[PDB]
């Protein structure tokens, strides 16, 4: 109401659109809107952190990209776009009745996609990916090669031992690989694929500082806590402080136990992963506890999956843009087997059945999902585990080439094959 | 008795193969492993799980028909002459150890006669001396009258071949066919696995030395009685690992497929002299 009245003074050439917060109409303009012309208040910036990369079960965004609220949104018809625009924002910044006019357009393109750049009072700056990139963005020296040693890796909430597989693919010599896990299927996977070399512990809630000390020094501590109780798109979520969210704190403890003391300058590195859909207070508390700001890395650059994840850690050069390698499969069609056709160009895991086979809507294959996530083929085919269990295992797992990108400079710090 | 002379190497051509009750396309995989050029590989099968296996593993090359009872002599003729016909009809309506069995002429036992028909239709006529070969498989444990009736129909006595000598599995099977020198004793190759323990993954121990498929859970894992793994069972039966991991089929379905599937090195042994009869890669 008040915001709508203000926008009146904006179009009467009495107020600059760049001087008003186009999300909620607050006067406390501090930052500029990264996607379009206008200002942004701090409160809306926090809302913008949570809501932009939230997707519903249909594979489209949960909320409007502009105001990061809205009660009824317009979905986008154009290929590979997942954005939504709430009716209210469209009926202000573009013009009155433009929203219902977009409702009636059966082949409709949203304003983020359409070829033209000017749309009424709404203007889109062309540098929005780079500004968005920067918006979401004790140093050890290099060790000389002869002094390099095999890496020792602790992987908490190890899952299917993706980290050891990545280090093997990079040809780094692994002295030992200790892994905490509770799911029998996931325990089996590591044993088989890595030939018994993986020391399986059990419940991470049994792991003491004494255990960590007597297991010998660790060179790399890695992990991803369960995201079911952190991800905001779960209505029944218990947050960071209840249910399975609190396993992150156990990770924080064992990382603290595994970190060298001050004055001991031996090389040590860590990587923690979580979903982008994590709450403002949850994300803030995690970011404060790990004493760093997260780097946001999207799988779509190197892994042909729309999987935007936060990575806390101290791996060197982890800000540098992702450079694809020829080995990597940037296309979903370059991962499916012959006779199957990809609906979309990227799979969505944070149409429901993204396969066209024999003019029929088929579901995603487990092995094709393996190839998408960058795992060497038939990695999770070890025991007599259900399709549901293998799907859940691949879903919770890391994107392999993203982990290869992050782990890549560790080759300059430990012994290589 | 019609025995074909050896074809000289320059005249050799790619093999044309009809595989009825093809299952998971074991025959094409063995011919490839033996390095015989395959012009075509037509396969009849009806279960989706098995259908997917061949498609993925052999890159669409396999011409799928479907129901064997939909395959006519006209179809066989327009699909061009075949050089090798292979197959194994359903075996647990023949096995005496299933009380509800229907024998050879009832239920699924009678499915062999379709194979017998299409084999006859695919066979060259008398006076046409072009090379042609066939191989049919079944379980040893069938009825004596059953075995006799099959022996009468296929105009040969079965060879009994046990898998365990070359495949570390108790799978004693009858093999009808007219492959040259198919009576010769089984030879072992270093590539082949003769010990169940060798097939098992690290941390697991084999109770027995040979599995029994024609203690019920023959695995020692972590001082516990575990069941057979499908990937270890594949390594037992001589298949390349992860052969059947193609679609969204249950572990029960994969077990059923590997149970009904051929022992690979036994079929490889029988297929071995075909290298002296067709073109090489
Ligand atoms: N209390 C607990 N103790 C040890 N592991 C647990 C646990 N609760 C959940 N987990 C395991 O931790 C995993 C976190 S999902 C992360 C999987 C892993 N990062 C990968 O790449 O595969 C889950 O698979 C779950 O099986
Ligand atoms: N009526 C029918 N028409 C076509 N195929 C059939 C059929 N009835 C059964 N089959 C298939 O024939 C197979 C016989 S079991 C033999 C499988 C194959 N010889 C192998 O070694 O893998 C079964 O897997 C079954 O799927
Ligand atoms: Zn605001
Ligand atoms: Zn909006
Ligand atoms: Zn769009």
* DSSP per residue, A212-252: HHHT---SEEEEE---TTTBTT-TT---TTSTTTTHHHHHH
C-alpha–C-alpha distance, residues B158 and B138, integer Å: 9
Q: Residue A341: which residues within 8 A CB-CB, separation 6 or more?
A: A333, A355, A356, A357
Q: Which two tokens stand for residue B82?
A: 């075949």
Integer Rg of chain A from CA? 23
Instruction: Calculate Rg over the CA atoms of chain B.
Output: 19
For chain A, how far is it from start to end, CA to CA, in angstroms?
A: 66
Burial B5-17 (b: 16+ CB within 10 A, else e): eeeeeeebeebbb
d(CA A374, CA A380): 13
CA atoms within 13 A on the CB side of A378: 14
Residues of chain B whose C-beta is under 8 A from some C-beta in A? Answer: 55-56, 59-60, 201-203, 227, 229-231, 241-242, 245-251, 255
* Token pair in block for residue A124: 């889109």
Resolution value in angstroms:
3.1
Candidate list A84, A227, A335, A366, residue with the active-site label: A227
Q: Specify the DSSP class assigned to residue A172.
A: B
Nearest 10 degrees: Cα torsion A240, A244, A246, A252: -110
- Please count the other Cβ atoms lying within 10 Å of the Cβ belonging to residue A122: 20
Residue among A270, A344, A278, A342 nearest A308 (CA): A278
Q: How far apart are CA A10 and CA A16, in angstroms?
A: 6
CA A122 vs CA A34, A90, B122: distances in Å: 13, 9, 73
Phi, psi dihedral angles at A284 (to 5 degrees): -65, -50
Residues of A contacting chain B (CB within 8 angstroms): 191-192, 195-196, 337-339, 363, 365-367, 377-378, 381-387
Q: Which residues, listed in sequence order, are joined to residue A152 by a DSSP beta bridge? A: A176
Distance A111 CA to ligand 4 centre (A): 13
**Crossing angle of helices A184-193 and A387-396, rounded to 10°:** 80
Proximal ligand: closest to the CA of A159: 1
Partner-chain contact B60 A381, CB within 8 Å: no
Q: For residue A226, which of A266, A162, A165, A182 has the smallest C-alpha distance? A: A182
Structure tokens at A251: 């990770």
CA B184 to ligand 3 centroid distance, Å: 86
Cα–Cα nearest to A188, from A375, A382, A366, A367: A382
Full DSSP string of A90-147: IIIII-TTHHHHHHH-SS---TTTSS--EETTEEB-TTHHHHHHHHT--PPPPPPGGG
Helix (H, G, I), strand (E, B) or coil at A199: strand
Residue to substitute from A185, A364, A379, A381, interface B, most B β-carbons within 10 A? A381
- Give A278's DSSP letter: B
Q: Is B47 in the active site?
A: no
Instruction: Give the CA angle between residues A316, A320, A322 to the nearest 5°.
Output: 115
Phi, psi of A102 (to 5 degrees): -75, -30
CA A308 to chain centre: 3
Q: How many residues make up chain A in this entry?
A: 417
Give the pairing of strands B169-170 and B211-212. parallel
Q: Which long-range contacts (CB under 8 A, 24 or more apart) does A251-257 make?
A: A251/A156, A251/A157, A251/A204, A251/A223, A251/A225, A252/A289, A252/A290, A254/A154, A254/A156, A254/A204, A254/A207, A254/A212, A254/A221, A255/A156, A255/A221, A257/A209, A257/A212, A257/A213
Experimental method for this entry? Answer: cryo-EM
Rounded Cα distance between B79 and B74, Å, is: 9
Query: Distance (Å, rounded) from C-alpha B239 to C-alpha B230?
Result: 11
Looking up tokens 């590989």 gives: B41
Is the Cα torsion angle A163, A167, A169, A174 positive or negative in sign?
A: negative
Four-CA torsion B80, B82, B87, B89, nearest 10 degrees: 50
Would you list which residues of B are annotated within the binding site for S-adenosyl-L-methionine? Answer: 22-26, 45, 67-69, 260-262
Locate breaks in chain A with C to N over 2.5 A; list the residue preceding each: 137, 350
* Residue A51 · residue A68 · CB < 8 Å: yes
Pairing of strands B133-139, B172-177: antiparallel
B88 three-class SS: strand
Q: What H or E segment, with its residue span, contains residue B266?
A: helix B264-271
Provide CB contacts within 8 A for A51, sequence distance 6+: A62, A63, A68, A69
CA–CA dist A188, A200 (Å, integer): 10
Task: Pull the structure tokens for residue A389.
Answer: 């269990």
């Amino acid at each position: 109401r008040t915001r709508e009245r203000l926008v009146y003074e904006v179009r009467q050439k009495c107020r600059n659109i760049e001087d008003i917060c186009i999300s909620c109409g607050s006067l406390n303009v501090t930052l500029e809107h990264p996607l379009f012309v206008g200002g942004m208040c701090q409160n809306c910036k926090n809302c913008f952190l949570e809501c932009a990369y939230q997707y519903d079960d249909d594979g489209y965004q949960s909320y409007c990209t502009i105001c990061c609220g809205g009660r009824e949104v317009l979905m986008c018809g154009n290929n590979n776009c997942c954005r939504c625009f709430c009716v209210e924002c469209v009926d202000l910044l573009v013009g009155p009745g433009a929203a219902q006019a977009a409702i009636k357009e059966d082949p409709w393109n949203c304003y983020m996609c359409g070829h033209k750049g000017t749309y009424g009072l709404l203007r889109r700056r062309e540098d929005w990916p780079s500004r968005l990139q920067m918006f979401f963005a004790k140093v050890y020296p290099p060790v000389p090669a002869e002094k390099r040693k095999p890496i020792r890796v602790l992987s908490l909430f190890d899952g299917i031992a993706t980290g050891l597989l990545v280090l093997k693919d990079l040809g780094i010599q692994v002295d030992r690989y200790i892994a905490s896990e509770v799911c029998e299927d996931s325990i089996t996977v590591g044993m088989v694929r890595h030939q018994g070399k993986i020391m399986y512990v059990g419940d991470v809630r049994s792991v003491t500082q004494k255990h960590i000390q007597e297991w010998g020094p660790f060179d790399l501590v890695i992990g991803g806590s369960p995201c079911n109780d952190l991800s905001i798109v779960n209505p029944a979520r218990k947050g960071l402080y209840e249910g399975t969210g609190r396993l992150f704190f156990e990770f924080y403890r064992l990382l603290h136990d595994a970190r060298p003391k001050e004055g001991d300058d031996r090389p040590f590195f860590w990587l923690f992963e979580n979903v982008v859909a994590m709450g403002v207070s949850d994300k803030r508390d995690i970011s404060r506890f790990l004493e760093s700001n997260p780097v946001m890395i999207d799988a779509k650059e190197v892994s042909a999956a729309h999987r935007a994840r936060y990575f806390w850690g101290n791996l060197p050069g982890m800000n540098r843009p992702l450079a694809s390698t020829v080995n990597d499969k940037l296309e979903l069609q370059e991962c499916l087997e012959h006779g199957r056709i990809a609906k979309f160009s990227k799979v969505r895991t944070i149409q429901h059945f993204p396969v066209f086979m024999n003019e029929k809507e088929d579901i995603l294959w487990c092995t094709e999902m393996e190839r998408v996530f960058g795992f060497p083929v038939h990695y999770t085919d070890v025991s007599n585990m259900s399709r549901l269990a293998r799907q859940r295992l691949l879903g919770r797992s890391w994107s392999v080439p993203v982990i290869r990108h992050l782990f890549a400079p560790l080759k300059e710090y430990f012994a290589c094959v």
